[PDB]
Ligand binder design. Structure first.
Ligand SMILES: Nc1ncnc2c1ncn2[C@@H]1O[C@H](COP(=O)(O)OP(=O)(O)OP(=O)(O)O)[C@@H](O)[C@H]1O
Ligand SMILES: [Mg+2]
Lengths: 240, 113, 1077, 171
């Protein structure tokens, strides 16, 4: 409880847990660093570990909001990237099978902010927050564990809205077929290299990608033992 | 079949002329006939072995087997009037009353007095 | 065959007796012969005089009942020096080591001068034999005292082969002459000289007890006792002729012992009558002929295997009891005769002795069946059958060896009822020497006749029979017997015939103007229960009608009535063990449920009929692509669902039976997986709306399927047939398979194992699932008791919280092993026999080193051939080479359908695999120490729940036992289909997702079926977890810990249990009640 | 009472110095390259080269795919193995396989050190050329390490030549 930051640098972020009749001051500890990355989407992010169950963005919106009011900081979380709590999205099966429609750790996620002004405000708020447990454990906020995404997730046996499903089929198929038609046109359009070389494309070929993957995936019988005089002379040596 | 029912099937098919065909006739070269015959034999073997006798009959009534022969042979040569001409039941397993009753979906008598 | 030859050598040396022990005993009994020669002579005495002689002595004459009375004992008694000789297997040097202990047979031939020619009448010779033994024991005792040897010798009378008329003296050594370590016991058999009595007078048909009825048992006893040394010489010659004689004998001895066969008396009730001597003698006869044409069936040049196979074949194929018998000459070529004596008969013309007189008809049948089954195993080439033939004991449990077991407590059990005893009488006394023999037949004939065709084989066993009694007593003393009957109670063991075990009515003779003899006995036997009835075909026959019950079989009812009416009206018949097992099956909430038998699948067929109505509606529907075929795959289609389907019972897990829908091949299918998945969904929409319009009475809704990892777009149409069933449709496309293979190839190498895992589940649900149901539904019609046992087994797994990890297919394939590969046992014919068997196999299964491979075919094609067998074997050896401990894959189950073997058993954590073996072993050990009884069953089916690290109690808002169709109820689906969730159990979905979070840290288990194993209201279910050892202890922190932990130091964290409890708590919401850590 | 069984996580119901001890350790530590490497060293000390290779392949698949550092330990554990005890072809195969799975330049870097540690300077010189040809246009470290290798071996004029080539190739 005296601990505030781990020597690897991770700021500890205690939380107070709800009151459930089954479980009659237990805390949940979240570990954070500043995340540095040249990739633009990964820039201005806050790295998080040991997240609570089903921690969607709205859970972080309240928590940063709780921080903002307490420490009068202006901070907004844009998005929570790489929040794969079950690991369902580890492999993008759509990307593997074809390039059309898809051009593409554990127990952790990246917390994106609006600007560097907001994130460093939050980091300072977290630093003060880390100190609270050592002194005054009562004023640690409370993680709710209930949110609209939680309720939908809890209701496993829910028939799907037919109309919403119906609309989804239509738009995707229209999207796919535009891509399918364009790709087929590209392959069979007399591609020529800058050096006046014409690519060979078979009939029924659909995606120039498939041509690449075909490539990547991929005299002795006509020789005569006795035709030249040196061959027979070799035979005669072995004969005697 | 999978139920150990040895049976013999006969399939009959005919060549057809395309929509824009101008030649009077539509004979197929012997290479195509052998190619078609190889495909037809494969499908008949695949369906029957991957099925029971009861399941096989359930395929015959809608004549789904014929449509698959067409879809497989569509590339080689256009065909018409594809049908399963005949089926012979050469050999049968030991009789199993339990299976027969299940296929058809015991009774106390009446006192005689 | 060379593998088999070596295996015999390895087995032969293992059981070989150690020669040092032979010398130690050979030291003893050679000296003992001196003591026997020390014993003096004795004079003619009357029964009064000998009684006075023994009146004060410690020894008592073991007279055989009826004991000699002064009036009928006019003939006098006398003793003379014997002719000491050694006989038996030890004589032939064919003995083997036995941990329990072997017996040395020493024969003393009382001199012929002590006989009159007519001493074989009215137990005259037997009574003389008795005192001759007693006089020896008297003097042997004092001479034993003189030599200072009595300190470590324990002398007691016993019956030879449990033959009441032939008492003998047994010498055993308790812990220089001390042979206790040898594990031997010297038996003193007092035989008669050869040809004292005319053998023709002693044939089985003739009688030697005046009262005329024949006396086969008494005639054999004296005649055999006079012909001992001759058969030794007979065996000795054949041993000299054929070199492989002794090796053949030991194999038969091992073969006999595993089946619980012995030379002991069988008319008393115990299984036996065919021992090493009978097996040996049969070989000797067959080496001198055996055919109907008197041609040799065995040749002296045969090896040990060939000799054993020939004898095994001959017993299996030739009938020796009802139709035909075999005659041979010990001192003449053996010839098989067609005429039969209705009893096991192996006649010996040279001696006029029937060697199988100790063999009962019922026992002989079980012998014939065992021989034939082993011949089948012997002729098998694909699988090695050495261990099954020789290295497996089938007699350890009666329940596993016999389909049904009934114990019958006879009345007034310190003597039987006067009425019961009065039934014995004199005429049966001359036929059957003892009441135990007579009662054994009485139970057998009524039990055999009443059950008739419903059974295959019957055994009547006298529980608590003793065969060795102290020298101070004249006969054995049973505690409940009181010198009246040597048994505590009788047990009736059956081998039921599944095809007709459950008939409602027992057929009988057809009606006639004049009552036929068969009609007479049928009417008399069944009494009021008899009835004359007409049928739809128009026949008139005598028949008796019973009532089916879901708690017990018809056979229990028949025998209970059968025994009371004929044996004794006070008899008590109780088989509670079978009753408890039947009740453990879920009782369906259908009309007249309690009266339906457990063999009735009417509930399943009703589901199939409703499906066919939907099956018709779909084809006549028009779509862009004509439907290729619709293949039902759901559990209820193959008679495996734990609870029988009930109309409108939608709370049950197995309400919605999956069905595969396949359209005709088209080349337009999307090449991209999600496009392909959503292309499939479009077709289901078209199927849905047309079905809605034309047939409004079908109610349908859409659900998502996430069984397949990373394929998040699968949508399945759920159809609610008006009759009250559910169906889940899914679309299979031929492009689907090749797309997955494309994903594997293009995936990164580190990811390839994961992608192939996804492919494994796809082929598990779509491609494999079809071939399994097809083979399993067909086979089940041959094995009637498959659907009950596999259902009850799946009930067992859920109670111990295993079904969550064991896929239902794997449970089926293990549960069918005892049927398709029943060796060395028989095919199960009872719920209790089959279930314990599945527990037995799992107990002795070494899944780390042994693969399980099954031939899913009907009883004797599609049987695995040697090439295919070896190929599957090769897969296992290659696999364990990569996984020697078995941590990745534990159970290797394969067949024609799954040659790979890893399709149905992948992804189970090792803790769950070991538990399923650990639970099995403890169960069998529990059955071993404590007999099969009500208390034992309850322990089997009640979970420990204490070993798990933390236990969380959950309660559903509403009891689901009614909505699961389980009779301790809904009649229409809710108007809003959203209401279905209000009557469902989410726990199976709760645990599965939480397992995925804590896969690195915890292993959570829950009861899938809450209605069956959740108490009276079916609302109590329990989630139980396990902390893996790594995260149980403190760890240095790292970004890759991937667990919910709390710090202790600057670089140390520990598993935050209390947080995880709250994670579960919010996740269960109102359901969670209590937490136990 | 109940049918209760103690939980077995070692399949037992069915420092390290032996085969069983390492296998026992791996039951609870499938992700530990230190255990796998130590198990590998025991077989190597036991002259079980063929068996040690088998443990190399098992360690690759058994360890969780996300333990990139632990995977790296095996691959260097391999490259040392074929370099010391194998042949040129076997080392080349693993070298080719290693770059397929892991970052190629890092694998190229480690083999360069292995040759230096084993004093296979001639092969180290060749690998520096091949590595520089492939990654010279992007990595300055290869040129610096190659320059150090030449300067350490008292080849100053060669080091100047490589620096000139580094300037040409590098942006
Ligand atoms: N069924 C039988 N018919 C005729 N004689 C028999 C029969 N059974 C036993 N005997 C006689 O009894 C003697 C001893 O019988 P027993 O069955 O003990 O012999 P064994 O084969 O040596 O037995 P063990 O297994 O104890 O060594 C046999 O040598 C034979 O003389
Ligand atoms: Mg004996």
């Amino acid at each position: 409880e005296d601990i505030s930051a781990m020597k690897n640098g991770f700021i500890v972020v205690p939380f107070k847990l709800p009151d459930h009749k089954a479980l009659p001051a237990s805390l949940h500890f979240m570990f954070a660093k500043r995340h540095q990355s040249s990739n633009s989407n990964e820039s201005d992010c806050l790295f998080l570990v040991n997240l609570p169950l089903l921690s969607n963005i709205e859970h972080m919106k309240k928590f940063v909001g709780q921080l903002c009011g307490k420490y009068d900081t202006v901070s907004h979380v844009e998005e929570l990237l790489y929040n794969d709590e079950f690991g369902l999205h580890e492999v993008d099966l759509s990307a593997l099978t074809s390039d059309l429609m898809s051009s593409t750790p554990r127990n952790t996620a990246l917390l994106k902010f609006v600007d560097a002004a907001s994130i460093n405000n939050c980091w300072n708020a977290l630093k003060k927050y880390s100190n609270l447990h050592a002194k005054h454990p009562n004023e640690l906020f409370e993680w709710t564990y209930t949110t609209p995404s939680f309720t939908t997730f809890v209701n496993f046996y829910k028939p799907l809205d037919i109309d919403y499903l119906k609309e989804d089929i239509h738009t995707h198929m229209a999207i796919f077929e535009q891509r399918e038609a364009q790709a087929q046109e590209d392959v069979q359009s007399s591609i020529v290299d800058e050096d006046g070389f014409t690519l060979v494309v078979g009939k029924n070929t659909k995606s120039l990608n498939s041509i690449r993957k075909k490539i990547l995936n991929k005299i002795d019988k006509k020789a005569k033992k006795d035709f030249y005089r040196f061959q027979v002379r070799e035979r005669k040596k072995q004969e005697i | 079949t999978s139920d150990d029912y040895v049976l013999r099937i006969f399939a009959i098919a005919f060549t057809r002329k395309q929509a824009n065909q101008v030649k009077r006739h539509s004979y197929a070269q012997s290479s195509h006939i052998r190619a078609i015959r190889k495909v037809i034999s494969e499908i008949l073997t695949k369906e029957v072995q991957g099925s029971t006798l009861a399941q096989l009959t359930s395929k015959l009534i809608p004549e789904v087997i014929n449509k698959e022969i067409e879809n497989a042979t569509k590339d080689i040569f256009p065909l018409q009037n594809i049908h399963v001409r005949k089926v012979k039941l050469l050999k049968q397993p030991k009789f199993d009353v339990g299976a027969l009753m299940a296929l058809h979906g015991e009774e106390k008598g009446k006192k005689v007095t | 065959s060379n593998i088999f030859k070596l295996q015999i050598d390895e087995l032969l040396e293992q059981v070989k007796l150690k020669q040092k022990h032979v010398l130690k005993v050979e030291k003893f009994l050679h000296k003992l012969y001196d003591i026997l020669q020390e014993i003096p002579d004795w004079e003619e005495k009357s029964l009064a005089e000998v009684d006075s002689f023994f009146k004060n002595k410690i020894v008592s004459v073991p007279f055989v009942d009826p004991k000699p009375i002064p009036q009928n004992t006019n003939y006098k008694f006398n003793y003379k020096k014997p002719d000491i000789s050694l006989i038996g297997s030890f004589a032939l040097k064919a003995g083997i080591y036995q941990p329990n202990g072997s017996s040395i047979d020493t024969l003393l031939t009382m001199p012929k001068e002590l006989f009159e020619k007519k001493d074989f009448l009215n137990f005259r010779c037997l009574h003389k034999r008795s005192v001759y033994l007693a006089y020896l024991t008297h003097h042997l005792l004092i001479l034993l005292k003189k030599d200072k040897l009595d300190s470590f010798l324990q002398l007691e009378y016993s019956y030879f082969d449990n033959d009441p008329l032939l008492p003998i003296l047994r010498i055993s050594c308790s812990k220089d002459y001390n042979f206790y370590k040898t594990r031997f016991s010297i038996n003193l058999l007092i035989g008669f000289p050869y040809k004292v009595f005319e053998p023709k007078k002693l044939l089985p048909n003739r009688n030697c007890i005046r009262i005329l009825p024949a006396t086969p048992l008494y005639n054999f006893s004296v005649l055999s006792s006079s012909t001992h040394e001759n058969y030794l010489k007979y065996l000795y010659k054949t041993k000299k002729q054929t070199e492989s004689f002794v090796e053949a004998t030991v194999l038969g001895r091992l073969w006999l012992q595993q089946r619980g066969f012995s030379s002991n008396m069988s008319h008393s009730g115990s299984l036996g009558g065919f021992g090493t001597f009978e097996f040996t003698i049969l070989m000797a006869a067959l080496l001198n002929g055996g055919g109907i044409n008197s041609n040799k069936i065995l040749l002296h040049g045969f090896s040990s295997y060939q000799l054993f196979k020939g004898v095994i074949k001959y017993l299996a194929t030739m009938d020796l009891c009802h139709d035909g018998h075999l005659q041979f000459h010990s001192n003449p070529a053996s010839k098989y005769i067609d005429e039969g004596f209705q009893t096991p008969t192996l006649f010996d013309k040279s001696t006029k002795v029937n060697i199988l007189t100790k063999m009962t008809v019922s026992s002989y049948q079980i012998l014939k069946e065992y021989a034939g089954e082993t011949l089948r195993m012997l002729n098998n080439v694909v699988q090695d059958q050495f261990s099954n033939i020789f290295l497996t004991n089938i007699s350890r449990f009666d329940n596993l060896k016999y389909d049904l077991c009934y114990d019958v407590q006879l009345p007034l059990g310190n003597n039987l009822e006067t009425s019961l005893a009065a039934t014995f009488g004199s005429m049966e006394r001359v036929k059957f020497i003892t009441l135990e023999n007579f009662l054994a037949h009485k139970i057998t004939n009524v039990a055999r006749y009443a059950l008739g065709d419903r059974i295959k084989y019957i055994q009547i066993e006298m529980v608590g029979q003793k065969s060795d009694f102290p020298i101070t007593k004249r006969k054995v003393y049973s505690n409940t017997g009181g010198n009246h009957f040597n048994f505590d109670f009788v047990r009736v063991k059956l081998i039921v015939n599944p095809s007709e075990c459950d008939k409602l009515v027992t057929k009988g003779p057809a009606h006639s103007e004049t009552m036929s003899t068969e009609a007479a006995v049928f009417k008399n036997f069944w009494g009021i229960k008899s009835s004359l009835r007409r049928f739809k075909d128009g026949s008139i026959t005598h028949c008796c009608v019973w009532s089916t019950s879901s708690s017990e079989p018809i056979i229990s009812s028949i025998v209970n009535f059968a025994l009371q009416k004929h044996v004794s009206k006070k008899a008590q018949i109780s088989n509670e063990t079978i009753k408890k097992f039947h009740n453990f099956l879920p009782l369906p909430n259908l009309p007249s449920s309690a009266k339906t038998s457990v063999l009735n699948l009417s509930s399943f067929f009703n589901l199939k009929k409703s499906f066919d109505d939907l099956y018709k509606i779909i084809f006549q529907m028009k779509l862009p692509l004509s439907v290729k075929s619709i293949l039902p795959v759901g559990s209820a289609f193959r008679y495996t669902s734990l609870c029988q389907p009930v109309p409108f019972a939608y709370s049950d897990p197995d309400f919605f039976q999956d069905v595969i829908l396949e359209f005709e091949t088209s080349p337009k299918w999307p090449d991209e997986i999600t496009s392909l998945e959503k292309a499939k969904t479009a077709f289901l929409l078209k199927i849905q709306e047309e079905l809605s319009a034309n047939s409004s009475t079908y109610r349908s809704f859409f659900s998502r399927d996430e069984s397949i990892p990373y394929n998040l777009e699968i949508v399945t149409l759920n159809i609610l047939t008006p009759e009250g069933y559910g169906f889940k449709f899914r679309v299979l496309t031929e492009r689907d398979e090749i797309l997955y293979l494309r994903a594997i190839a293009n995936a990164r190498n580190e990811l390839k194992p994961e992608l192939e895992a996804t492919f494994l589940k796809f082929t598990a649900k779509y491609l494999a699932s079809v071939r399994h149901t097809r083979t399993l539904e067909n086979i089940s019609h041959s094995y009637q008791f498959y659907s009950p046992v596999v259902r009850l087994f799946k009930r067992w797994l859920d109670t111990h919280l295993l079904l969550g990890h064991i896929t239902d297919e794997l449970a089926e394939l293990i549960a069918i092993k005892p049927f398709v590969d029943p060796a060395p046992y028989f095919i199960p014919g009872s719920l209790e026999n089959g279930f314990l068997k599945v527990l037995k196999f799992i107990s002795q299964w070494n899944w780390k080193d042994d693969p399980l491979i099954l031939d899913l075919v009907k009883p004797e094609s599609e049987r695995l051939t040697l090439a295919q067998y070896k190929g599957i074997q090769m897969n296992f050896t290659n696999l364990r080479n990569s996984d020697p401990n078995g941590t990745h894959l534990q159970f290797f189950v394969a067949s024609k359908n799954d040659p790979s073997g890893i399709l149905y058993s992948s992804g189970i954590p090792l803790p769950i695999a070991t538990r399923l073996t650990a639970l099995a072993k403890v169960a069998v050990n529990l059955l071993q120490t404590h007999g099969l009884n009500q208390q034992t069953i309850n322990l089997l089916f009640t979970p420990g729940l204490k070993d798990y690290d933390f236990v969380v109690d959950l309660r559903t808002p509403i009891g689901l036992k009614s909505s699961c169709g389980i009779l301790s109820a809904p009649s229409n689906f809710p108007e809003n289909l959203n209401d279905l969730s209000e009557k469902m159990d989410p726990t199976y979905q709760l645990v599965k997702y939480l397992n995925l979070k804590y896969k690195n840290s915890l292993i959570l288990s829950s009861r899938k079926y809450i209605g069956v194993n959740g108490g009276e209201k079916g609302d109590k279910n329990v989630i139980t977890g396990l902390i893996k050892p790594l995260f149980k202890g403190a760890h240095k922190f790292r970004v890759n810990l991937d667990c919910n932990v709390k710090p202790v130091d600057d670089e140390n964290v520990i598993l935050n249990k209390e947080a995880i409890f709250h994670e579960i708590a919010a996740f269960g919401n109102d359901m969670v009640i209590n937490f136990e850590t | 009472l109940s049918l209760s069984a103690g939980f077995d996580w070692t399949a037992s119901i069915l420092a390290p110095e032996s085969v069983a001890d390492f296998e026992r350790l791996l039951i609870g530590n499938p992700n530990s390259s230190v255990v796998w490497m130590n198990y590998m060293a025991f077989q190597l000390q036991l002259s079980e080269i063929e068996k040690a290779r088998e443990l190399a392949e098992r360690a690759l698949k058994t360890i969780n795919f996300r333990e990139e550092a632990e995977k790296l330990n095996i691959w260097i554990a391999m490259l040392n193995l074929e370099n010391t005890f194998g042949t040129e072809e076997t080392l080349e195969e693993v070298f080719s396989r290693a770059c397929q799975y892991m970052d190629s330049y890092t694998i190229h870097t480690k083999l360069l050190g292995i040759y230096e540690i084993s004093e296979k300077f001639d092969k180290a010189a060749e690998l520096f050329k091949a590595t520089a040809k492939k990654f010279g246009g992007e990595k300055v470290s290869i040129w610096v390490s190659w320059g150090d290798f030449l300067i350490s071996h008292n080849e100053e004029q060669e080091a100047r030549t490589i620096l000139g080539n580094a300037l040409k190739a590098l942006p």
